[PDB]
Amino acid sequence: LRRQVDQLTNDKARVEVERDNLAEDIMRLREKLQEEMLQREEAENTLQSFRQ
Amino acid sequence: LRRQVDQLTNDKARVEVERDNLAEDIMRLREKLQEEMLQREEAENTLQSFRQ
Amino acid sequence: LRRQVDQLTNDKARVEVERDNLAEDIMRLREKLQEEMLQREEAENTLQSFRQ
Amino acid sequence: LRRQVDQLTNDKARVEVERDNLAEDIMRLREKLQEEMLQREEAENTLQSFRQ
Amino acid sequence: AKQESTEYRRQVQSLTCEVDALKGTNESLERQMREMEENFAVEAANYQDTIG
Amino acid sequence: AKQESTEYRRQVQSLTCEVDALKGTNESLERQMREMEENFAVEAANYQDTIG
Amino acid sequence: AKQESTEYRRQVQSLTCEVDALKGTNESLERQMREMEENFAVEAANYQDTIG
Amino acid sequence: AKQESTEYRRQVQSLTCEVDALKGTNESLERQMREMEENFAVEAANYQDTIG
């Protein structure tokens, strides 16, 4: 019984620790795709505004 | 020549601002939709470690 | 100067279509990307209910 | 024997529902990246046209 | 009580990323307003100099 | 109760910073309105004596 | 100097949105130190079932 | 200065949006530091719940 009680005591503490770590580790991999696409849509929209 | 300039460049600038509004709305929506990714695509695959 | 403005007008009209190519693929992407941020907020809330 | 068969049942059908959500994440981040890749392949040359 | 404290931890983490993304969208509107406002100040100065 | 005390604090603090960023947006426009009014008025005064 | 004044005002207003979005996330670190005190409430709960 | 203004409006708006994207990156990097505060906390405390 205690083997499966120690199983949650890994499972719960692991899902809580992995949530709050991978929030920053993957948010800082979406922020860099925003860097790559703002360097496209700057290069589109500003080039209509430079024509007006 | 310069009267052809004034009447040509300004009907083009009317058609160009009829597109510059779409390119400002997509560039505004990039910044927002990437802020949406910064939370949602971190949570997504992080919570698949926990799906297991 | 007039050859450079007959050119800048034909350029204005060409390059508005060459931006309409990019900004129509970004406009399709932006509309599908509002639909995707709902698909990834569905992934956040679904997989966070499954984390609970 | 119950705990061994139970741990093998859990590890089996874990991978069954893990996989199908992990195939959805790996599609959700791809839908974005593939539609961005379509624009990015036209947008190579048009950005040198725009500036000329 | 530890399981409830782990479900409210997922609600905390999800709602943090959701309001961090809405804040990051309001900062993205603030930055797009600046890049339109930098054009409006330059268009006003160019117009007034051209007239005088 | 400390996890739930972290929920309400993050949400209220981040909603306060959203109102602060939307005021930073309004102050950028309320400044730009004066920067264009100064660009119109100062160069109208420089050209008033020159035209006169 | 008015195109330059429109630039550094936008960059300073964007930095003002940083400094107040950072504080609303410093008010979020004050919640992750409560998700700590809840992970210590799970230590105290597994120590309650220990002691009992 | 009229010729300059045609790049200067884009340079201003790009350097505004690149500052504003670094500002949405810095608030979202403090969100990676909050999610690291939760990771060091669940590492310290939830591991000792598993010892509990």
Swiss-Prot record, chains A, B, C, D:
It is found in: Cytoplasm; Cytoplasm, Cytoskeleton; Nucleus matrix; Cell membrane. It comes from the Eukaryota. Highly expressed in fibroblasts, some expression in T- and B-lymphocytes, and little or no expression in Burkitt's lymphoma cell lines. Expressed in many hormone-independent mammary carcinoma cell lines. Induction: Up-regulated by muramyl-dipeptide and lipopolysaccharide. Disulfide bonds: none annotated. The modification N6-acetyllysine is found at residues 12, 32. One of the most prominent phosphoproteins in various cells of mesenchymal origin. Phosphorylation is enhanced during cell division, at which time vimentin filaments are significantly reorganized. Phosphorylation by PKN1 inhibits the formation of filaments. Phosphorylated by STK33. Phosphorylated on tyrosine residues by SRMS. O-glycosylated during cytokinesis at sites identical or close to phosphorylation sites, this interferes with the phosphorylation status. The central alpha-helical coiled-coil IF rod domain mediates elementary homodimerization. Belongs to the intermediate filament family. Vimentins are class-III intermediate filaments found in various non-epithelial cells, especially mesenchymal cells. Vimentin is attached to the nucleus, endoplasmic reticulum, and mitochondria, either laterally or terminally. Plays a role in cell directional movement, orientation, cell sheet organization and Golgi complex polarization at the cell migration front. Protects SCRIB from proteasomal degradation and facilitates its localization to intermediate filaments in a cell contact-mediated manner. Homomer assembled from elementary dimers. Identified in complexes that contain VIM, EZR, AHNAK, BFSP1, BFSP2, ANK2, PLEC, PRX and spectrin. Interacts with BCAS3. Interacts with LGSN. Interacts with SYNM. Interacts (via rod region) with PLEC (via CH 1 domain). Interacts with PLEC isoform 1C. Interacts with STK33. Interacts with LARP6. Interacts with RAB8B. Interacts with TOR1A; the interaction associates TOR1A with the cytoskeleton. Interacts with TOR1AIP1. Interacts with DIAPH1. Interacts with EPPK1; interaction is dependent of higher-order structure of intermediate filament. (Microbial infection) Interacts with HCV core protein. It is linked to Cataract 30, multiple types: An opacification of the crystalline lens of the eye that frequently results in visual impairment or blindness. Opacities vary in morphology, are often confined to a portion of the lens, and may be static or progressive. In general, the more posteriorly located and dense an opacity, the greater the impact on visual function. This is Vimentin. It comes from Homo sapiens (Human). The lineage of its organism: Eukaryota, Metazoa, Chordata, Craniata, Vertebrata. The chain holds residues 157 to 208 of 466 of the full protein.
